[PDB]
Amino acid sequence: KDLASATNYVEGNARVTSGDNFKHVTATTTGTVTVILSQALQSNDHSLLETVLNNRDERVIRDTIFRLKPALAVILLERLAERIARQTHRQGPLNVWVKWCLIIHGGYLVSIPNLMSTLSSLHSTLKRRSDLLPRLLALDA
Amino acid sequence: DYVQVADGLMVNKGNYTLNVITKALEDTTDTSNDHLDNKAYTGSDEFLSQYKIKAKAKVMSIKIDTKNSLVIAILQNGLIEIFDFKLTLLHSFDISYDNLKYAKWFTENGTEYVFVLCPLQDDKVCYKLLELTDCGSGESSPIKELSSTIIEGFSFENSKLCYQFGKLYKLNQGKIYIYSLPHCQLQQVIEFPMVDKLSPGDDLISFQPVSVNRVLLTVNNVIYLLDLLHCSTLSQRELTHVVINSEKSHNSKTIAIGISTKNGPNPTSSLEIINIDVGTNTLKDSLGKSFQVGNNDSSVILKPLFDDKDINDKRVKCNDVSGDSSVPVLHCNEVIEKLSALQDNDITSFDDIFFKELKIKEEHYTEKDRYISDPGFLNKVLDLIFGKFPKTLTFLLTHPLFPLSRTRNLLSLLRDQPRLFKQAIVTCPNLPLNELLEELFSIRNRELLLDISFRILQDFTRDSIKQEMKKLSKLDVQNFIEFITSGSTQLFQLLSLVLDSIGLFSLEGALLENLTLYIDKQVEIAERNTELWNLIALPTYTMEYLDI
Amino acid sequence: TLKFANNSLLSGIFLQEEENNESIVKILLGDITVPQQAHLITVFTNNGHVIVLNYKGKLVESPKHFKISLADEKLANVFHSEGNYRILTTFKHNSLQSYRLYALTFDDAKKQFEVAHQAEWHNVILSNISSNGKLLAHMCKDVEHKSISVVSLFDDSVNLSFPLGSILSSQTQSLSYNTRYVSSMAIDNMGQQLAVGFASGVISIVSLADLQIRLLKWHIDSVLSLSFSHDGSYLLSGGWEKVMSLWQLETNSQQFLPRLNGIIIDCQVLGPQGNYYSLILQMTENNSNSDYQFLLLNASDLTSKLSINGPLPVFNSTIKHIQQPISAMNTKNSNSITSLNHSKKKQSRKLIKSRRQDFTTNVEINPINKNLYFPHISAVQIFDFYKNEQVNYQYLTSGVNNSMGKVRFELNLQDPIITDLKFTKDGQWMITYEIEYPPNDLLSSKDLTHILKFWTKNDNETNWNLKTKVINPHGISVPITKILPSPRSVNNSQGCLTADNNGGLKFWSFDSHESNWCLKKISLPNFNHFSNSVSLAWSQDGSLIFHGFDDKLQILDFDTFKKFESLENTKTVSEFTLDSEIQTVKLINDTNLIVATRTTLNAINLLRGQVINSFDLYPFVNGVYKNGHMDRLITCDERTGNIALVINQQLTDVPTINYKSRIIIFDSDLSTKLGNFTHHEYISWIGWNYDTDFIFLDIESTLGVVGTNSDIFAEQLHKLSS
Amino acid sequence: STARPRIITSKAPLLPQQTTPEQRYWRQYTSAQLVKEHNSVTHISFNPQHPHDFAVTSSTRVQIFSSRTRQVIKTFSRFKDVVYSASFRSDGKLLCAGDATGLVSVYDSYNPRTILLSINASTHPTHVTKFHTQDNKILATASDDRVTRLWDISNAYEPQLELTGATDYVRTLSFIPAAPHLVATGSYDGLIRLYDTRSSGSTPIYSLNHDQPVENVIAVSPTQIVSCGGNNFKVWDLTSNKKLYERGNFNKAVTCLDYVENFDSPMQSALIASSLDGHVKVFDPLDNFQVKFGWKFSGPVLSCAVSPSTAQGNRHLVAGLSSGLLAIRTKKKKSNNFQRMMRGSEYQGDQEHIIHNDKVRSQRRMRAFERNINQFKWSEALDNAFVPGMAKELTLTVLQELRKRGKVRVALYGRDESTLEPLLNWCLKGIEDVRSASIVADWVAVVLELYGNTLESSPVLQELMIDLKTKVRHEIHKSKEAQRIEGMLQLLT
RNA sequence: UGCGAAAGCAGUUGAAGACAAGUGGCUUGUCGUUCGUUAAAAUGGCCUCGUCAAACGGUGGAGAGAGUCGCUAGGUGAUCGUCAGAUCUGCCUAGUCUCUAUACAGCGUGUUUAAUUGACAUGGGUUGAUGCGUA
């Protein structure tokens, strides 16, 4: 090609990222589903993770996360964050799970030393969901 | 150039050992050791020893005795080893070697015939160097470095008995001519205030620096370029900096002339014969952040005033960018004389202080930028008005409008005049957030709440607000929530800050439901006026009329 | 390269600190002194000097120069034919010039050229001369409107004239003024036809014997350049689209050449058979300077044989009687048909009266191969200064920068601005920051995008590859005031530190595991005040960072990335409130650091933790630079000092359009002014190349530097076989 | 002059859980085959040499499948009890099978009728039989006799070495892949013993205490070996006798392992693990045995294998389940007068001094929207956006190119009811996504700015505007509640 | 236009002269005219140099598509009916369940961290659109 011809712009396979991925630093309760959820999260079992969080009764979700062990509430929250990042219609039903994980395990993940670095994907997903709120405010006006 | 300053034989062991340091003793028989226990046998003692070392075995120990030779000891087992005399004059500073690293038959008198670490192994006779008063051993390629008071430097390597280099080094009577921490240099201290680093591979000075103050017992630490130094008639062992993977914190070197300062670690209490107390407990020299602490060996501050670019035909200055003036006529002598003109009998009046300051600095009396000023000068005139004399109407108005006020601002709540207090809220450019939060939560329910929330938001980071607004009671925050719900943007985000910083669980319910209802209607009105701001052909048959 | 300032032979013609209207106006290939014998050129300047210069071998140390006996006239051009020589001259009502043609002779006394005065034209609007130089056309403005007159100059072969209302259509008199404004004209080597290019976009070939016109409509914006071929059967045209068209005048058939990195402001055929086209490309994405690229190209395959260009910086403001060229609408890249006179009056008044006379730019030096990288608008010119020719040119944003010649409305769109770029200290990566601007009159027209890109090349290839980009670093709509590359001790010189106007900092670093440049460290404060008076510095050890926000120089560490702390409180002063917002925090070496703010210039030691020196800047640099440009005005070294740099706009007996530069150096914490230099022109950027020199960029872009039998048979055979 | 820059497809910031190269490679193992066996598939080995066939050990038969048709080419049915192990020799020439009566029978592969020799091992069931990987003529059989045996296949009467020492149920052998004197055996008491065969052999030289009862031990390097048993697997440096990784990413016991090297893959090595709960997972030995991909199967997976390192054809992952069936997932791969007339067209300049090359490279074909943006047909480019078969990022990038490049209004000028309905009917779908909704916002804003009268006239885009209103209402409830979650974890810092 | 932060905050928009049109003046409008102020349109759009097919390597994906009326949560309709509720085995959406050449998109394989080969005489001539129906 010519020597005076400028180089065109080409991204190629450059990784486009945002500025918000901080990935670097007797019974009497119900019949819940938390053994299913716990041995979904001990492995990486997307299939039975989907069969445990297609349950959407609020008291079942509530005491399920209450009976959950708090050392893996952070990875339940990571799985929920990645699923609502990918599928956008899940944000309605699945963020009921993410608000209950914060309310119940409000001590474990305030005692964790790097909250944003450990659940970066939630922060990036909610930042990109709520960043454009003035724009669709102007749109619906 | 100092370090963290406090604390007013096998050379690589520590504690949990028995005695890896057996050393000689002043005004005693020969030598001793202690524990935190190994036996103290004899290395053919009772001579004129001045130091004592071992072969890094502690049961092949010795007494380095001034008799031209040395033998072995049995400090653990009971079985001695044989020896062989070389000289008979002074071997008081004998240092037995490792498995063929650095050894020669140099006693005291220029007879450095090379040998090995054995009782009968020999080498060449490398006694060629002159009468050396400072002979040390380093590990460049294990080498005897001689500094001679016939003055001349030489460096022989006891790896093939090869004289590596040598020159004419005019070294006088020294204090400590100790080899460097990486061994590449020679730190030789002059008597009172100086320590020069010379190149110990070519026998030449590389950096001849002065030191801070009096120091006598100086030696290089196990550091990059740092030394330790104890005072002569002082127990003060300070540190200075002119091993690099995971460095030392204690048990670095034992050469000191304090009150029996043997076996000097960081916690240097349990000595080898002395049984003394301990001191500082820091590590060696770091890269560059500890020299902001140890900012010593320079204390020569003067009164720095603003100079000017030198007038070499400055009359062709070509359209100066000021309003009307060209250069302020600087009067630092009148700046100093204004102190004498102010510290007078105007003990309640603004006739001989405020007029004096506004005559020395001809400004609009609330404005900067006609500067020529010093922070020590402003601090001393602020001290002279904080003395026998806030009733001046020009001086203490034009100098909270100065970015160098230096922390005499704490009584700004403790004096309460309205216009001077609001001016010290808005314009005083260094304010303590403790007093700012106290003034914020000592509410007088006025617009100065907005004026104090403004500054507490616009000069402190949010987490530094949160950690120091944890330091509040609960009646303050309950009345704060009550006053917000009663009766704006910066106080909304301040309300966000108080909710983030009160904590998680320990709350009440009625205040929470009141705040919930209030902010629900607040989001509703914010949504509707955001909507308001974002809100700012022919038929087939007609019938009409025309003029008649 | 015949350097003018190399010798007093013709630097005595111009070395002035005030007068650069002495310009070089024509070059001729022969020797006007002695005929019939050529390897040397005779240059006519715009004042009246005629220098004869040998460009084969070494330049002679006394050229054959003369000075023609001239009136107040100022030398439009000269003209050559067989044997004879003409010259044309300009004059002193309505602001129009006036032209006057002379003929030359030389022979009797070999110092003077005698002149003859053929004729005059008492008001000239526009002019052109044919390719052979045998005839010339021009416009008149003689009343209801203008007029058009063609005249052969080397003979009275033809001279005709007519009012151009007989050229113009009947539609144009009820249309806009662009339809009757004429911005170009050309004649062929016979004077049979003439091309009138109008500002509306059309061209019209009139046939001069009978004044019948033919319209050629392709240019959708104004026609800026026209030329004929030698036989007259092809018309080259160029305009605001960056497309050179050539019209086959038999069938009216265009051949195009579409993406020519600049608008064609002049085009002409060049060879005897017409095998080259020479073009001038105006490159009008930056409005602050008129930077022309000279590009001939062989006519065979239309490939750019020998493109020529100077350095292309973009200054912060317009420079010196710079007028962006004519067009159809008044845009942000051009100006309409009305506003040229008002725009030049306003620009002269802005340079006279106003206060923010800062036109300073950022230039970077690639620390591997020592060539300097002028970031143009949405592109970079990589340019090496040991031969002063461009290495290449590369588009670094995603605009409509290259794909399209924008026209009348579309010139109100701007491609994203590259505002920062810095190399990592081993020259392996290039960090760049750009502001992507939205088009107007839609919902998202008032929120910018901020994009930080990371580029890589090996040491052979001339162009960089994007490895990653982060859109909105630091958050949405927030700028980057300063990026700082990192020293060789953090991630082997593969980290960058970006600063907000909130005082937030982000440390980005490239790790090989996840093979990308990712976000490592973060310190965000959430204030409610913003200021772009942000500066940054790093310790060479890689331990502590000096974050010079406005009025406040915070001291952060690197391990926990918060403000510096020692629990012993050994007067741990970790903030330095100064009298004004600080714009340089340049640390010369690990002992001390020079702060520069808009009143004073302080220096602060850290092995002796207090102020050591101070200087007065307010009488020199008061409110004249934008806050954040003292960092490009002053610089440093790594051993041997620091360089301040001030500017004096000169004065009459009010300020003027003339400038002088006062650069000063200091060694070792502001001790001695051991360099006090004065340069004859405004200075825009200074920076230290990595081998103890400092390069600076003049406002007219001269880079300067502050440093430390058989013999006769052989001769006759090389004659007779060449 | 340059060439024209291509229209760059709008890529947003990347979302979490992107497609890694490892999981793209391991996800193109597809077209699963399910073959119902008579009983649980206990072992599966591959042919080493032409690595293109594999033997599946069901109950009382061993079937060799081909790696190109996936049908049973050959089968071995003349066992008396349940056949347990079946492996090929390192030359791939013959096949050993341990049987529940303690009768090792070795046939030759690809000939089920010629049983070559029947070693009568212990009276207990023989559960693992494999040849040496360096040597050819020795066969190691461990049984439920708590003693393994090395047999020379010439002298098949007494075992040439008898490796005893284990307290319970030795179920696995392994050989160390550079030292051929080194046999690592693994039993149901934990305790990977390993033996130097030049010594006595009744005592291991050392023992590695996997705490769970091991199910398999394989050798990865000449130095490190991996033992699975219980819910985890551990890796052991063998020159230093010392554990260095352990991954417990399963629910139930890891039944088997195998390992791949140097094959055509982004992963330079791969250890896959099969674990009685349905899962088979692949772990990458170069970044600290991190899991990269996995398959879930319809029952507890008892054994697994992949095609060997030199497969050169159709590549296989096979997993046999305890349910009694077998799952295969593969990745696949004019006249002499006229020629004498047109001879030279394949010469390419070998003996020729100068070789000129200016044939330009043929680039990718332009799509219709890209050539219409090139031809400045901006309304036609919008029309080419809203065809049905267009990718969502392609509609987004032509909207963004018309937004940045020229004029939304130019692209929308000559429209009416029938030619706006594609745009708004796509804007319904694009208003949900984050990456599109800014562009959807300003395009809808411009079209209602300049078609507010067609709003009045046509009722059949009024309803489209109402549906768009309820869409933005749902999305604004979502973008508000996301800010509420953002605050409610900002509280927890 | 100035100060600014990317928000915003203060300032506006005169005079002379000439010309054109309309009805020597009067009105209106222009200016390749000057002084002062910090101050939309002339049917008129971007070149050839070789395409097609099949791979391969990284990069993104809202995945490209097809089912099961299988589950979870919903939004809603026709007719009758007092409601209760009936039939339409009511419809639509999202998630889940199942499957495919990851079907989708993009950059590259001339040297690159990586990754490419093959077809074709890259012409001329005659019909080819009024010859066509599966709608």
Residue burial C569-585, b: 16+ Cβ < 10 Å; e: rest = ebeeeeebebbbbbbbb
Nearest CB to B534; choose among A107, A110, A141: A141
Question: Tokens in use for C640?
Answer: 């041997």
- DSSP one-letter string for D339-376: HHHTTTTT--SSS-S-----PPPP-PPPPHHHHHHHTT
Residue of A nearest to B528 (CA): A141
Residue burial C125-154, b: 16+ Cβ < 10 Å; e: rest = eebbbbbebbbbbbbbeeeeebbbbbbebb
Residue from B449, B31, B470, B474 nearest B272 by CA: B31
Q: How far apart are CA B475 and CA D399, in angstroms?
A: 57
Number of A:B CB contacts under 8 A? 11
Q: How far apart are CA D24 and CA D22, in angstroms?
A: 5
Q: Which nucleotides of E are covered by protein (CB under 7 A)?
A: 1-7, 19-20, 30-35, 37-47, 49-53, 55-65, 71-73, 94-102, 104-110, 112-114, 120-122
Length of chain D equals: 493
C586 and C594 Cβ atoms separated by less than 8 Å: yes
Method: cryo-EM
Asked whether the beta carbons of residue D8 and residue C398 sit closer than 8 angstroms, the reply is yes
Taking the C1' atom of E121, which residue's CA lies nearest? D342
Q: How far apart are CA D423 and CA D85, in angstroms?
A: 65
D358 has a chain A CB within 8 A of its CB: no
Residue type, B274: I
Residue type, A38: S
Question: Tokens in use for D221?
Answer: 């390097």
Which of A132, A137, A140 has the highest number of chain B CBs within 10 A, making it the mutation to test binding with B? Answer: A137
Q: How far apart are CA B93 and CA B51, in angstroms?
A: 5
Which of C312, C467, C519 has the highest number of chain A CBs within 10 A, making it the mutation to test binding with A? Answer: C519
Give chain A positions within 8 Å (CB) of C476.
Answer: 131
Residue type, C357: Q
A121 and A81 Cβ atoms separated by less than 8 Å: yes
DSSP B367: -
Residue from C216, C205, C194, C179 nearest C138 by CA: C194
A14 has a chain C CB within 8 A of its CB: yes
What stretches of C403-476 adopt beta strand conformation (E)?
A: 417-423, 429-436, 449-456, 465-471
Please list, in sequence order, all residues whose beta carbon lies within 8 angstroms of the beta carbon of residue D361, skipping any fewer than 6 positions away. none
Asked whether the beta carbons of residue D438 and residue C444 sit closer than 8 angstroms, the reply is yes
Q: How far apart are CA B242 and CA B227, in angstroms?
A: 8
D438 has a chain A CB within 8 A of its CB: yes
Please list, in sequence order, all residues whose beta carbon lies within 8 angstroms of the beta carbon of residue C599, skipping any fewer than 6 positions away. B369, B371, C579, C580, C616, C617, C618
Question: At B217, is the secondary structure helix, strand, or coil?
Answer: strand
Residue from C249, C317, C333 nearest C284 by CA: C333
Number of B:D CB contacts under 8 A? 8
Chains touching D (at least 3 CB pairs under 8 A) are: A, B, C
Angle between helices D421-430 and D462-490 (to 10 degrees): 20
Residue type, D6: R
Please list, in sequence order, all residues whose beta carbon lies within 8 angstroms of the beta carbon of residue D138, skipping any fewer than 6 positions away. D131, D132, D150, D151, D152, D153, D160
Q: Whose structure tokens read 């107390």?
A: B277
Q: Which nucleotide is nearest to C218 (CA to C1')?
A: E44
Segment (H or E) for C11? helix C8-11
Q: What is the CA radius of gyration of chain D?
A: 33
Distance of CA C396 to the CA centre of its chain: 19
Asked whether the beta carbons of residue A138 and residue C471 sit closer than 8 angstroms, the reply is no
Asked whether the beta carbons of residue A138 and residue B504 sit closer than 8 angstroms, the reply is no
D127 and D98 Cβ atoms separated by less than 8 Å: yes
DSSP C193: E
Give chain D positions within 8 Å (CB) of C443.
Answer: 441-442, 445
Count of beta carbons in the 10 Å neighbourhood of residue D436:
23
| Distance of residue D450 Cα from the nearest chain A Cα, in angstroms | 15
Q: How far apart are CA D230 and CA D250, in angstroms?
A: 9
CA-based angle C650:C654:C657, to the nearest 5?
45
| φ and ψ of C316, to 5 deg | -70, -25
Q: How far apart are CA B341 and CA B343, in angstroms?
A: 6
Q: How far apart are CA C140 and CA C128, in angstroms?
A: 13
Question: Tokens in use for C608?
Answer: 């002796």
Runs of H (alpha helix) within B324-364: 332-342, 354-360
What is each CA distance from C612 to B202, B308, C152, C577, C605, in whole angstroms? 36, 15, 76, 16, 7
B317 and C627 Cβ atoms separated by less than 8 Å: no
Which of C218, C267, C443 has the highest number of chain D CBs within 10 A, making it the mutation to test binding with D? Answer: C443
What is each CA distance from C193 to B481, C186, C196, C435, D261, in whole angstroms? 88, 9, 10, 49, 79
Residue of D nearest to C470 (CA): D13
C266 and C281 Cβ atoms separated by less than 8 Å: no
Count of beta carbons in the 10 Å neighbourhood of residue C6:
11
Residue burial B406-416, b: 16+ Cβ < 10 Å; e: rest = eeebeebeeee
Say what the alpha-carbon torsion angle C163, C169, C170, C173 is, to the nearest 10 degrees: -70
A65: Cα within 13 Å, side-chain hemisphere: 25
Say what the alpha-carbon torsion angle A122, A123, A125, A128 is, to the nearest 10 degrees: 170
| φ and ψ of C560, to 5 deg | -105, -5
C513 has a chain D CB within 8 A of its CB: yes
Residue from B403, B446, B393 nearest B427 by CA: B403
CA-based angle D394:D419:D372, to the nearest 5?
45
| φ and ψ of B347, to 5 deg | -75, -15
Distance in Å, residue C96 CA to nucleotide E23 C1' = 34
Q: Which nucleotide is nearest to D12 (CA to C1')?
A: E60
Residue of D nearest to A90 (CA): D478
Sheet holding C307-308, edge to edge: C264-269, C276-281, C293-298, C307-308
Q: How far apart are CA C184 and CA C128, in angstroms?
A: 8
For C450: left if phi > 0, alpha if psi spans -120 to 50, otherwise beta; the answer is beta
C329 and C408 Cβ atoms separated by less than 8 Å: yes
Angle between helices A91-104 and A73-86 (to 10 degrees): 160
Residue type, D311: A
Q: Which nucleotide is nearest to C502 (CA to C1')?
A: E5
Q: Whose structure tokens read 């250890």?
A: D271
C645 has a chain B CB within 8 A of its CB: no
Give chain C positions within 8 Å (CB) of D3.
Answer: 259
Distance in Å, residue C687 CA to nucleotide E54 C1' = 55
Give chain A positions within 8 Å (CB) of B528.
Answer: none
Which of D457, D481, D488, D491 has the highest number of chain B CBs within 10 A, making it the mutation to test binding with B? Answer: D491
Q: Whose structure tokens read 């399963």?
A: D250
Distance in Å, residue C435 CA to nucleotide E41 C1' = 33
- DSSP one-letter string for C283-350: -TT-SS----EEEEEETTTTB-SSEE-------SS--SS----B-SS--SSSB-SSTHHHHHHHHHHH
For C447: left if phi > 0, alpha if psi spans -120 to 50, otherwise beta; the answer is beta
Count of beta carbons in the 10 Å neighbourhood of residue C461:
9
Taking the C1' atom of E38, which residue's CA lies nearest? C354
Taking the C1' atom of E106, which residue's CA lies nearest? D9
Q: Whose structure tokens read 């800050």?
A: B497
Taking the C1' atom of E4, which residue's CA lies nearest? C531
B244 has a chain C CB within 8 A of its CB: no
- DSSP one-letter string for C597-654: ESSEEEEEESSS-SEEEEEE-TTTSSSSS-TT-HHHH-EE-SSS-EEEEEEEEEE---
Give chain B positions within 8 Å (CB) of D452.
Answer: none
Residue from B380, B447, B438 nearest B414 by CA: B438
What 3 state SS string does C91-147 have? CCCCCCEEEEEEEEECCCCCCCCEECCCEEEEEECCEEECCCCCEEEEECCCCCCCE
Question: Tokens in use for D61?
Answer: 């038969």
What is each CA distance from B319 to A95, B322, B323, C317, C648, in whole angstroms? 66, 9, 11, 20, 7
What 3 state SS string does chain A have? CCCCCCECCCCCCCEEEECCCCCCCCCCCCCCCCHHHHHHHCCCCHHHHHHHCCCCCHHHHHHHHHHCCCCCHHHHHHHHHHHHHHCHHHHHHHHHHHHHHHHHCCCHHHHCCCHHHHCHHHHHHHHHHHCCHHHHHHHHC
C697 and C674 Cβ atoms separated by less than 8 Å: no
Q: How far apart are CA B369 and CA D72, in angstroms?
A: 95
Strands A15-18 and C465-471: parallel
Give chain C positions within 8 Å (CB) of B294.
Answer: 570
Count of beta carbons in the 10 Å neighbourhood of residue B374:
18
| φ and ψ of D345, to 5 deg | -80, 15
Give chain C positions within 8 Å (CB) of D369.
Answer: none
CA-based angle D9:D15:D17, to the nearest 5?
120
Count of beta carbons in the 10 Å neighbourhood of residue B340:
10
| Distance of residue A50 Cα from the nearest chain D Cα, in angstroms | 14
Residue type, C633: L
Residue of A nearest to C523 (CA): A25
What 3 state SS string does C504-530 have? CEEEEEEECCCCEEEEEEEECCCCCCC
Residue of A nearest to C509 (CA): A24
Residue type, B39: K
Q: Is the dihedral of CA B83, B85, B86, B89 positive or negative?
A: positive
Give chain B positions within 8 Å (CB) of C354.
Answer: none
Residue burial B433-457, b: 16+ Cβ < 10 Å; e: rest = bebbbebbbeeeeeebbeebbbbbb
Question: At D463, is the secondary structure helix, strand, or coil?
Answer: helix
Residue from C354, C332, C218, C225 nearest C286 by CA: C332
Q: How far apart are CA D236 and CA D226, in angstroms?
A: 6
Give chain A positions within 8 Å (CB) of B463.
Answer: none
| Distance of residue A24 Cα from the nearest chain D Cα, in angstroms | 14
Q: How far apart are CA B401 and CA C579, in angstroms?
A: 10
Nearest CB to A137; choose among B504, B505, B530: B530
DSSP D7: P
C582 and C535 Cβ atoms separated by less than 8 Å: yes
Strands C544-549 and C535-538: antiparallel
Please list, in sequence order, all residues whose beta carbon lies within 8 angstroms of the beta carbon of residue C96, skipping any fewer than 6 positions away. C123, C124, C125, C141
Q: How far apart are CA D54 and CA D75, in angstroms?
A: 11
B375 and C611 Cβ atoms separated by less than 8 Å: no
Q: Which residues does B contribute to its contact with A (CB < 8 Å)?
A: 504-505, 530-531, 534-535
Q: Which nucleotide is nearest to D365 (CA to C1')?
A: E51
Residue of C nearest to A131 (CA): C476
D294 and A44 Cβ atoms separated by less than 8 Å: yes
Question: At B339, is the secondary structure helix, strand, or coil?
Answer: helix
